[PDB]
Amino acid sequence: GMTEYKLVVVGACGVGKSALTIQLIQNHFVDEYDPTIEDSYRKQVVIDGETSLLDILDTAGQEEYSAMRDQYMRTGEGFLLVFAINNTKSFEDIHHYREQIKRVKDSEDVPMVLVGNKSDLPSRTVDTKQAQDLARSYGIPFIETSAKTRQGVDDAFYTLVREIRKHK
Ligand SMILES: *CCC(=O)N1CCN2c3ncnc4cc(-c5c(C)ccc6n[nH]cc56)c(Cl)c(c34)OCC[C@H]2C1
Ligand SMILES: Nc1nc2c(ncn2[C@@H]2O[C@H](COP(=O)(O)OP(=O)(O)O)[C@@H](O)[C@H]2O)c(=O)[nH]1
Ligand SMILES: [Mg+2]
């Protein structure tokens, strides 16, 4: 019946991949979620008045290449590129995450959203403009989020489904 989209949440350790996903699915903020737990969650959502089944993979584990990570990138239809706005290293790591998805999908136009997480925190080291300029250069949306307050959480995932729908 309804369309199903495979979403993948990527980004450096500690940016809030797990916190963002569990806020979307279960409507609470996790303070300390085990960094090895990689699991997928299913949720029906209405976006722009059309229902879709989202199947969301929250990535975890070691800094390693694997043919299996290549696989869930290959099956993934859209990617959240998550950094934390208080962690410049996580922002500098976005290039790596995009390159490895671009490697396995052989496209610079795969549906993606840049997510600047932890927007509730005062000591920002990455400004709106620097993230907007990065997303513009990539040809993707930028969304500021807080897993803690829920600000922008739905918008990040919904915006990615909007990007997958335009793609064909
Ligand atoms: C605190 C744990 C955690 O969340 N992470 C640390 C290990 N990660 C990680 N580190 C470096 N490079 C990663 C690359 C990929 C990757 C992509 C994006 C695409 C295809 C592919 N094929 N082999 C690896 C990859 C992934 Cl999937 C990583 C990477 O995931 C593990 C979680 C990530 C963050
Ligand atoms: N203040 C704040 N802390 C967050 C936010 N998102 C995640 N955290 C915290 O940052 C840490 C890492 O989050 P986690 O979701 O485990 O990161 P992951 O390794 O990307 O899954 C945890 O302590 C979270 O509670 C956020 O939006 N705001
Ligand atoms: Mg996690």
Coordinates of C-alpha atoms and ligand atoms in Angstrom, one line a residue:
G1 CA 0.0 0.0 0.0
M2 CA 2.1 3.0 1.4
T3 CA 5.6 3.7 0.2
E4 CA 8.5 2.5 2.5
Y5 CA 11.8 4.4 2.8
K6 CA 15.1 3.1 4.3
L7 CA 16.8 6.0 6.2
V8 CA 20.3 5.8 7.6
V9 CA 21.6 8.0 10.5
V10 CA 25.4 8.6 10.3
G11 CA 27.9 10.8 11.9
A12 CA 30.7 10.7 14.5
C13 CA 30.5 9.1 17.9
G14 CA 28.6 11.2 20.4
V15 CA 26.7 13.6 18.0
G16 CA 23.3 12.2 19.0
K17 CA 22.4 9.6 16.3
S18 CA 20.8 7.3 18.9
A19 CA 19.2 10.3 20.8
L20 CA 17.6 11.7 17.6
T21 CA 16.3 8.3 16.5
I22 CA 14.8 7.4 19.9
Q23 CA 13.2 10.9 20.2
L24 CA 11.6 10.3 16.8
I25 CA 10.4 6.7 17.6
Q26 CA 9.7 6.7 21.4
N27 CA 9.3 10.5 22.2
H28 CA 12.0 10.6 25.0
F29 CA 15.6 11.9 25.4
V30 CA 18.2 9.3 26.3
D31 CA 21.1 10.7 28.5
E32 CA 23.5 7.8 27.8
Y33 CA 22.7 5.2 25.1
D34 CA 25.1 2.3 24.6
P35 CA 27.4 3.4 21.6
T36 CA 27.6 -0.2 20.2
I37 CA 23.8 -0.7 19.8
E38 CA 23.0 -0.4 16.1
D39 CA 19.3 -1.2 15.4
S40 CA 16.5 -0.3 13.0
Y41 CA 13.1 1.2 13.9
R42 CA 9.9 1.3 11.8
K43 CA 7.3 4.2 12.1
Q44 CA 4.4 5.3 9.9
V45 CA 4.5 9.1 9.4
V46 CA 2.4 11.5 7.3
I47 CA 4.7 14.0 5.4
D48 CA 3.1 16.7 3.2
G49 CA -0.3 14.9 3.7
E50 CA 1.0 11.5 2.3
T51 CA 1.7 8.5 4.7
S52 CA 5.1 6.6 4.5
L53 CA 6.6 3.8 6.4
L54 CA 10.1 4.9 7.6
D55 CA 12.7 2.1 8.4
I56 CA 15.5 4.0 10.2
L57 CA 18.9 2.5 10.9
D58 CA 20.9 4.1 13.8
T59 CA 24.6 3.3 12.9
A60 CA 27.1 2.3 15.6
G61 CA 30.3 0.3 16.2
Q62 CA 34.0 0.7 15.2
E63 CA 36.0 2.9 12.8
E64 CA 36.4 0.2 10.2
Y65 CA 35.5 -0.4 6.6
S66 CA 33.1 -3.5 6.1
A67 CA 31.3 -4.8 3.0
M68 CA 28.3 -5.0 5.4
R69 CA 28.3 -1.2 6.1
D70 CA 28.6 -0.8 2.2
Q71 CA 25.4 -3.0 2.1
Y72 CA 23.2 -0.9 4.4
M73 CA 24.5 2.2 2.6
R74 CA 23.5 0.4 -0.7
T75 CA 20.0 -0.5 0.7
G76 CA 19.6 3.0 2.3
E77 CA 17.5 5.5 0.2
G78 CA 18.4 8.6 2.3
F79 CA 21.1 9.6 4.9
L80 CA 21.1 12.0 7.9
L81 CA 24.6 13.5 8.2
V82 CA 24.7 14.4 11.9
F83 CA 27.2 16.6 13.7
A84 CA 27.0 18.4 17.0
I85 CA 27.1 22.2 16.8
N86 CA 29.5 22.2 19.9
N87 CA 32.0 19.8 18.3
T88 CA 34.1 21.1 15.3
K89 CA 35.7 17.6 14.8
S90 CA 32.2 16.1 14.2
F91 CA 31.6 18.8 11.6
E92 CA 35.0 18.2 9.9
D93 CA 34.1 14.4 9.9
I94 CA 30.9 15.0 7.8
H95 CA 33.1 15.1 4.6
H96 CA 34.3 11.5 5.4
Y97 CA 30.7 10.2 6.0
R98 CA 29.5 11.8 2.7
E99 CA 32.5 10.5 0.7
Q100 CA 31.9 6.9 1.9
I101 CA 28.2 7.1 1.0
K102 CA 29.1 8.8 -2.3
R103 CA 31.6 5.9 -2.8
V104 CA 29.0 3.1 -2.4
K105 CA 26.2 5.0 -4.3
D106 CA 28.5 6.5 -7.1
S107 CA 26.4 9.8 -6.9
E108 CA 26.9 13.2 -5.4
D109 CA 23.0 13.6 -5.5
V110 CA 21.9 10.7 -3.1
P111 CA 19.2 12.0 -0.8
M112 CA 20.8 13.5 2.3
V113 CA 20.2 16.1 5.0
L114 CA 22.8 17.9 7.1
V115 CA 21.8 17.8 10.8
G116 CA 23.4 20.2 13.3
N117 CA 22.4 18.6 16.6
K118 CA 22.6 19.7 20.3
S119 CA 21.3 23.2 19.3
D120 CA 20.0 23.7 23.0
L121 CA 23.7 24.0 24.1
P122 CA 25.2 27.6 24.4
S123 CA 29.0 27.0 23.4
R124 CA 28.4 26.5 19.6
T125 CA 31.8 26.1 17.7
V126 CA 30.0 25.7 14.2
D127 CA 27.9 28.7 13.0
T128 CA 24.6 28.5 11.1
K129 CA 26.3 30.1 8.0
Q130 CA 29.3 27.6 7.9
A131 CA 26.8 24.7 8.0
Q132 CA 24.4 26.3 5.4
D133 CA 27.4 27.0 3.1
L134 CA 28.4 23.3 3.4
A135 CA 24.8 22.0 2.7
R136 CA 24.6 24.5 -0.3
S137 CA 27.9 23.1 -1.8
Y138 CA 26.5 19.5 -1.3
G139 CA 23.0 20.5 -2.8
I140 CA 21.2 19.3 0.4
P141 CA 19.1 20.8 3.1
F142 CA 20.5 21.8 6.5
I143 CA 18.3 21.4 9.7
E144 CA 19.3 22.4 13.2
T145 CA 18.1 19.9 15.9
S146 CA 18.0 19.2 19.6
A147 CA 17.3 15.5 20.6
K148 CA 17.0 17.0 24.2
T149 CA 14.2 19.6 23.5
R150 CA 12.8 17.8 20.3
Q151 CA 13.4 21.1 18.3
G152 CA 13.7 20.2 14.6
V153 CA 13.7 16.3 15.2
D154 CA 10.6 15.6 13.1
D155 CA 11.7 18.3 10.5
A156 CA 15.1 16.5 10.0
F157 CA 13.5 13.1 9.2
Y158 CA 10.5 14.6 7.2
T159 CA 12.9 16.8 5.1
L160 CA 14.9 13.7 4.2
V161 CA 11.7 11.9 3.0
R162 CA 11.0 15.1 0.9
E163 CA 14.5 14.6 -0.6
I164 CA 13.9 10.8 -1.3
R165 CA 10.5 11.6 -2.9
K166 CA 12.0 14.1 -5.5
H167 CA 14.7 11.4 -6.3
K168 CA 13.7 8.6 -8.7
Ligands
LIG1 C1 30.5 6.0 19.0 C2 30.4 5.0 17.9 C3 29.9 5.6 16.6 O1 28.8 6.1 16.6 N1 30.7 5.7 15.5 C4 32.1 5.5 15.4 C5 32.4 4.6 14.2 N2 31.8 5.1 13.0 C6 32.6 5.2 11.8 N3 33.8 5.7 11.9 C7 34.5 5.9 10.7 N4 34.0 5.8 9.5 C8 32.7 5.3 9.4 C9 32.3 5.1 8.1 C10 31.1 4.4 7.9 C11 30.7 4.0 6.5 C12 29.9 4.8 5.6 C13 29.4 6.1 6.1 C14 29.5 4.3 4.4 C15 29.9 3.0 4.0 C16 30.8 2.3 4.8 N5 31.4 1.1 4.5 N6 32.2 0.8 5.6 C17 32.1 1.7 6.5 C18 31.2 2.7 6.0 C19 30.3 3.9 9.0 CL1 28.9 3.1 8.7 C20 30.8 4.1 10.3 C21 32.0 4.9 10.5 O2 29.8 3.6 11.1 C22 30.0 3.2 12.4 C23 29.5 4.3 13.2 C24 30.4 5.5 13.1 C25 30.2 6.4 14.3
LIG2 N1 22.4 18.7 25.2 C1 22.2 17.7 24.3 N2 22.8 16.5 24.5 C2 22.6 15.6 23.5 C3 21.7 15.8 22.3 N3 21.8 14.6 21.6 C4 22.5 13.7 22.3 N4 23.0 14.3 23.4 C5 23.9 13.6 24.3 O1 25.1 13.4 23.7 C6 25.6 12.1 24.0 C7 25.7 11.2 22.8 O2 24.4 10.9 22.3 P1 24.2 9.6 21.4 O3 22.7 9.7 20.9 O4 24.6 8.4 22.2 O5 25.2 9.7 20.3 P2 25.6 8.7 19.1 O6 26.9 8.0 19.4 O7 25.7 9.5 17.8 O8 24.5 7.7 19.1 C8 24.6 11.5 25.0 O9 25.0 11.9 26.3 C9 23.3 12.3 24.7 O10 22.4 12.4 25.8 C10 21.2 17.1 22.2 O11 20.4 17.5 21.2 N5 21.4 18.0 23.2
MG3 MG 24.4 5.6 19.2

